[PDB]
Symmetry: C3
Subunit: 194 residues, 3 copies
């Protein structure tokens, strides 16, 4: 399975687009799997003892976390080798905004274990992302004060994703998520895996 990492800053509509990518690939009868990196990390944590739930996993020693990310990364690469023909997409972050600053989602020890073909950056107009902050308060962590915060996050995601791309030899692709339709992004993503 050819691997593609789909990243997006909160509010871009990454879950809707991913739902559309699966729907379109199933309809063409094309083998595909969509893995949520955080969920697979937790699954990995459960299988190897490290922790029994998220809070437990999150309050873990930095040296343990780095091991766990490596094992999850190795695990996902296995899933891809085992699934044969198809497309495996990872749903993760290029950068995670934290109070302590931007944390790269694909650091060297993770990215070179996975070796993806493509890293996607889901972007939209900062205005459209601010509207999707108060329109759908399905988490509402209201971290995006003004659009200058969104812009800055977009940019750090761009810098971090390219640095991860340079490490693995993968391409970086910007995909605009159209407000109306999620199918535009979904087809651009599918076109890129060809």
């Amino acid at each position: 399975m050819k691997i593609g990492i789909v990243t997006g800053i909160p509010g871009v509509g990454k879950s809707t687009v991913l739902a559309k990518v699966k729907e379109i690939l199933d309809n063409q009868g094309i083998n595909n799997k969509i893995i949520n990196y955080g969920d697979f990390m937790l699954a990995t944590a459960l299988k190897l003892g490290y922790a029994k739930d998220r809070d437990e996993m999150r309050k873990l020693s930095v040296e343990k976390q780095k091991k766990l990310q490596i094992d999850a990364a190795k695990g996902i690469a296995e899933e891809a080798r085992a699934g044969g023909e198809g497309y495996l997409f990872i749903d993760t972050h290029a950068v995670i905004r934290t109070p302590s600053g931007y944390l790269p989602g694909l650091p060297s020890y993770v990215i070179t274990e996975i070796n993806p073909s493509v890293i996607f950056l889901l972007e939209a107009d900062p205005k459209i992302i601010l509207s999707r902050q108060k329109r759908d308060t399905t988490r509402n962590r209201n971290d995006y004060s003004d659009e200058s915060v969104i812009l800055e996050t977009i940019n750090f995601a761009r810098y971090a994703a390219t640095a991860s791309a340079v490490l693995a030899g993968s391409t970086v692709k910007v995909i605009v998520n159209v407000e109306g339709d999620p199918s535009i992004a979904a087809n651009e993503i599918i076109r890129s895996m060809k």
Copy 2:
């Protein structure tokens, strides 16, 4: 020792802010060391005959600067091991303007010796930085002619620091140094270390 790297372009008030961090951590009795990267570079340079003053080290061939960089990094790595517990702040740069172009302050061979937790980008409005540079003649710097050169250097600092963050697994925090109030930045810096 928990390492935090504090970078900033010349004129952001890196020192002002760093003094205030020592004040605040000394006053609450927390063990903290503040090392200036360039001071360690100059020591090694002086003993080898490469340069006499800090403002000439950046004019050196890329290969000599690389040598000083590795030596300094090995030194600071040693001081961090003999610190036991508490916060170590490395006062340095994300990028160094040189006749040969921008030299990354935290290349892979430096990042592997230190392994910071957080990498800070101290920033300020370019107009405010342009002024601060003319008020200091214990340094100088004729390369910061207009506001265009400062923007471009703030950007390369961002690109470079994020690439370094991605290699290390560390976070990158942009801190605005509020004109006239070093304690804001100093406190964001302290909170981010927790």
Copy 3:
């Protein structure tokens, strides 16, 4: 020999600038070699039987191209150590635009084998790049639709070149290619190599 990597996005006048670097150095009797990374790749293909022309080379498996990229990188490093004093310049790309997104021209497994001192980024005004687009069809590049795509390509190139510079510890030099005279750029390239 000191290694310099000269990159530019299509349409900046890189081959012209590279010719002046050769003439100015010849008329100074400085030893210099100017290698095209893809050509060196092609050469290694032939002498290993993989491919026979640029066209059949660009069709090879991903694992095969990667093979060619490493050996070519290693090879170019031997050529520079063998060549004694002097300046070796590699003409390649910082990023390449592909249907899958931006492909880093200097991934880790390549930049760490070459270990340049300088990575140059030739830029020009977007308008100028477009102006040369209608003017020459040695090629006929109809990929640059508008100036916003030129801008994006430029930033990705900076992002990637900086990341590559952080892995090898090389500088990143932006060189503006002036439209009237290609010597402004070649003198800067040469100055930067001292």
